[PDB]
Design a protein around this ligand. Sequence first.
Ligand SMILES: C[C@@H]1C[C@H](C)C[C@H](C)[C@@H](O)CC(=O)O[C@H]([C@@H]2CCC[C@H]2C(=O)O)C/C=C/C=C(\C#N)[C@H](O)[C@@H](C)C1
Ligand SMILES: C[C@@H]1C[C@H](C)C[C@H](C)[C@@H](O)CC(=O)O[C@H]([C@@H]2CCC[C@H]2C(=O)O)C/C=C/C=C(\C#N)[C@H](O)[C@@H](C)C1
Ligand SMILES: C[C@@H]1C[C@H](C)C[C@H](C)[C@@H](O)CC(=O)O[C@H]([C@@H]2CCC[C@H]2C(=O)O)C/C=C/C=C(\C#N)[C@H](O)[C@@H](C)C1
Ligand SMILES: [Zn+2]
Ligand SMILES: [Zn+2]
Ligand SMILES: [Zn+2]
Lengths: 398, 400, 400
Amino acid sequence: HRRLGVSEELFFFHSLSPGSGFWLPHGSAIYFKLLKFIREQYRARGYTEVITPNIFNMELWNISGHAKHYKENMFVFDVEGQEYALKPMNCPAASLMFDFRQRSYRELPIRYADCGVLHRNELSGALTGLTRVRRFQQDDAHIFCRDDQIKKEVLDFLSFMKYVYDVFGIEFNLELSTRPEKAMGELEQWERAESQLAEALDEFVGAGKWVVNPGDGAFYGPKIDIMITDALKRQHQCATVQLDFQLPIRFNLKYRTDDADNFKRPVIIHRAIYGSLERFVAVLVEHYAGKFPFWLSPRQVLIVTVGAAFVDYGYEVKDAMFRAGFDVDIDDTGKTLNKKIREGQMAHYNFILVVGAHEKETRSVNIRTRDNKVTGTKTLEEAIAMFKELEETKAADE
Amino acid sequence: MDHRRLGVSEELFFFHSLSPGSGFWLPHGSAIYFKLLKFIREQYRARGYTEVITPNIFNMELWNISGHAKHYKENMFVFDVEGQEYALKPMNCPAASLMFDFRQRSYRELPIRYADCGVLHRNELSGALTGLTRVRRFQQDDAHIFCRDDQIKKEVLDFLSFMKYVYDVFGIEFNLELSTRPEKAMGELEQWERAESQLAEALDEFVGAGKWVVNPGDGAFYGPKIDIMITDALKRQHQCATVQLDFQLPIRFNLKYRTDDADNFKRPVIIHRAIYGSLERFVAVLVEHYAGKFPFWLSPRQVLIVTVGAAFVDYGYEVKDAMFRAGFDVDIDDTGKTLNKKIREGQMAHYNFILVVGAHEKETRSVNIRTRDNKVTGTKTLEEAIAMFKELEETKAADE
Amino acid sequence: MDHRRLGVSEELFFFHSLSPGSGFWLPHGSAIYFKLLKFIREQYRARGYTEVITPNIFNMELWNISGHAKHYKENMFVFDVEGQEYALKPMNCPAASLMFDFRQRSYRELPIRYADCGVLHRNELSGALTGLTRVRRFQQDDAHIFCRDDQIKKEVLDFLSFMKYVYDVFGIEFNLELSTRPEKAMGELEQWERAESQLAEALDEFVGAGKWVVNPGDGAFYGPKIDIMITDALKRQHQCATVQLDFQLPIRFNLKYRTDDADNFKRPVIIHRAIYGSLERFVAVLVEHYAGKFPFWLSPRQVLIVTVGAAFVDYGYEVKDAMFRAGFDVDIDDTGKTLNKKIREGQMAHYNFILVVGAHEKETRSVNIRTRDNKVTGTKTLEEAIAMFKELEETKAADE
Ligand SMILES: C[C@@H]1C[C@H](C)C[C@H](C)[C@@H](O)CC(=O)O[C@H]([C@@H]2CCC[C@H]2C(=O)O)C/C=C/C=C(\C#N)[C@H](O)[C@@H](C)C1
Ligand SMILES: C[C@@H]1C[C@H](C)C[C@H](C)[C@@H](O)CC(=O)O[C@H]([C@@H]2CCC[C@H]2C(=O)O)C/C=C/C=C(\C#N)[C@H](O)[C@@H](C)C1
Ligand SMILES: C[C@@H]1C[C@H](C)C[C@H](C)[C@@H](O)CC(=O)O[C@H]([C@@H]2CCC[C@H]2C(=O)O)C/C=C/C=C(\C#N)[C@H](O)[C@@H](C)C1
Ligand SMILES: [Zn+2]
Ligand SMILES: [Zn+2]
Ligand SMILES: [Zn+2]
């Protein structure tokens, strides 16, 4: 069906910035709602969102390993004779934030969310739509925990992830990817960590129903491989849980351990659910075929006027809908009523509200669904109450 | 060179969830794809290439011999036939070798240029499939060039010339670089130096000495490469063309030629080469490059006839029939809409030419031509108008 | 009457143990295959067909819908993609449906004729796979036609006419049978009747009441068909052509068209049709049929130039080049061999013409012509000769 084609005013691309989206108002509306949902959860689940820089001195990248492993994918420039790069990952700035002041063990775990803009270089010809972009924002958060806290942190992540996915009807599958041949930890770290990942997995999924990919871990840590399935039965990688034993060392991260004096290093968990906002929108656009659910739709309500006489009343309905918080439009024109309705359905509006003489006199709306079902005439108060519930509950169509 | 892009995709092809990553080409798209094939084939004939036809599925032992098993298995669709491992072909490059090995060949015979347009398959994750840029299924304009060591410069020079010729038709620009023996490599040094020397020489020639860049150590482990990047009207860069030499594949398949006399056999050098890169990919480039407005020869919507009135329809259909016989891709609007709408609706559809027919025109037995960008070419007779269209096609003319 | 006559007949094509059941078409072979495709493609354009391109692998859910999963699975190659079942297509007939369903279609459009020349695989047991007659891999000249039920007789009549026309070119003969509704059939009765009546009517018009036969109850469960049998010069009978209606095919895929400019929809009829049957198979037929002596238009060895002396070789290449530029497949023997030998050798290799060039010919810009079947034509100017060859090609002339 086409992420890009479905640009009935969601997003576009221009040759002056290939790989970077232009999000039109209706497009933005979706992006923002997704952010608002993720943020509502972050607050509920113990995360604090932080803001970080976008350009850094190459020295940061040297420390991280990005200079070694990633440089080809980065936008590199000169500042005052010094090499600088646009950030491809938030994952190092987050470490600096954690090192800002000394941390005690009781504090674990610290969870920082970052919605910052990332850049990765890709060849211009290679770029298409939102699937392969230069510019994106991850729903990134990087979690710092004690070694004993891994199972709970992972378990908690899985619920968060599941909770989100459930909202959209999206399926997932989990595997454990274990230590590779070239790997940088001590054995002790890997065993404790993998054991916990297993434990979390056998609690979340239960003993039997998860495969292991032995030796498929990152050099820097063990991971749980997540794959998601859309309604067309395509698979995407959106979610991650990746442990990192390297980054804590490189940035010299520590927490004071009760009796200390001494200190220990935290484990870092790089994690995401959307993967990026850009990527997730692309998935959803196709997954719903451009028929979004009422909460996330940028075209929630359309008012259609029966005749010129009821047009002012329509503007009244629209005002009320807008104040109540809805994305609402009004047809307004001399077009035939049947036409107006059909067009609105074509536009994908979740609800069409026809207002005639009856509605005006009784302060009500006559409601038609996207699917052309005939919900009842309802009063304005009743309609608003209905929409709120749909919104609040994040109800699906199906 | 400044516009909003229109990637995947305007509608000449589509994709279905039942085969994600594999195109369905609608009649207008197919027409383009077949037109490209025809052009390359016309060139192949003129330039010493013979197109061959090969199998699509092979036993894994082939891939074992090739190196695909070690390096590529991950991207292959692999399956069982009667207990034996099999795979759909990622590349033609191995079957071509077997063709070379069919019968004994002599040095006089070089260079044997075999072209293959066969369907290839590579595995890619479904989520990550979008458009024609990343597909499971594609057809390369692939062509292997089996040659003597002494023959590389000419064959490469000949290739570069073919490539430029094709690209110029489309207004496409290119940049050439040389990539040289890497640290981990498989051949003998001599074959590498002789080859790289011939390559530089080819570059000095065409591009000019000191005007081209070297990427030292950026070649493949099985041979030197000329790295090519092409640039479209939007200033985007693509990898479509390739020249890659291969010393491994000839060993693996035990390829030989008889040298003058019977002293010895020598192994040929292989050059894996391409210009379109793949038909699916080239189209995707062209669609953007032209912004949906193809040049007359290549357009699936060359001529649209529009009728002023009903007394006129018969004349148009007659006109339309003449255009069709003449070989043109022609459509008609016999509907009753007001003219300006007809013209505008057609222009929107990117018809190269709109042919307007009125009472005078019938009687005139002639035609009134409006160009795509709205220019009033003014009326003409049939036989001439055709002659004029025929000429744009024969010459492969670009628009204004 | 004489030994026969395929597989061994060279050069043309070969099989390898790495892909049994899949042909390797050597250049002389490909040349034949391409010509056949090109002939069929010319006819398609002339006859309202549009060729399209389709995917080669599909999720199993497509085959479940079509009936392939029930009926055909053991004849298919099946593999896993991302944990889901997939198969290589044994038929194009289902992809064509998806194409039809891409956009709403109207009574105005009918009939819709989509040609597909795509690659198909069927999983035959390896021991059974001999030659081109029984292969894993093939390209059909498939077209699956979409029409209103009232359009059947006219469409079938048009097909028969197209088919006779192709066969006539080769001197090939046909016989027609009608297979009617089986005991276990799936239609509504009416549709079968209406259809069967139309078919009989086309048959009556095409060949007359006398000349066709009926096989009652030999129809497919999903449709009535016309059996076509063709006869070669050796009096061997082949089935290549078919016309098979399908009533199931459209229900399964929920196909419809708008009948009016109101609110009403009907299902189309599908006709799965072929003439060559497969390109691999039609070649096998033609090789035997001609005994390797192909008519000039289709020959991969049209002209051989033979030189009388060393002093004449350069004029000879001059001749060869002109011949090639003219579009002919042409070779030269510049060997030291006796002229009488060269000629006999060319004739054995089956070249249609031998062009003898000597001093008078070089002096005159002439050739001295001998046919395949010996037979001495005499002298022509290089121009006359090319014009003569052009006529034979253009008309697709038989030797007799
Ligand atoms: C500099 C190294 C690059 C690495 C080898 C690149 C690989 C292709 C791959 O490992 C990247 C990866 O899986 O990152 C994944 C991220 C999480 C979201 C998806 C992926 C994302 O952002 O794309 C996690 C790692 C972040 C890592 C670090 C930092 N700093 C590492 O400590 C450091 C060793 C990375
Ligand atoms: C099995 C090996 C896989 C190779 C190492 C994959 C690399 C990513 C890369 O080297 C592929 C490549 O450059 O192929 C390029 C092809 C040519 C057209 C574009 C590219 C194409 O078709 O994509 C050509 C190489 C074909 C090579 C072989 C064969 N047989 C080699 O002898 C064999 C050793 C290759
Ligand atoms: C799944 C079913 C298999 C069928 C019962 C197998 C039989 C052996 C025979 O019926 C096949 C046949 O006659 O096909 C003939 C084809 C046409 C060219 C030659 C023959 C060819 O390609 O071999 C036509 C039917 C294609 C049909 C379908 C599709 N999709 C049907 O709607 C579907 C019900 C077919
Ligand atoms: Zn990270
Ligand atoms: Zn190759
Ligand atoms: Zn069929």
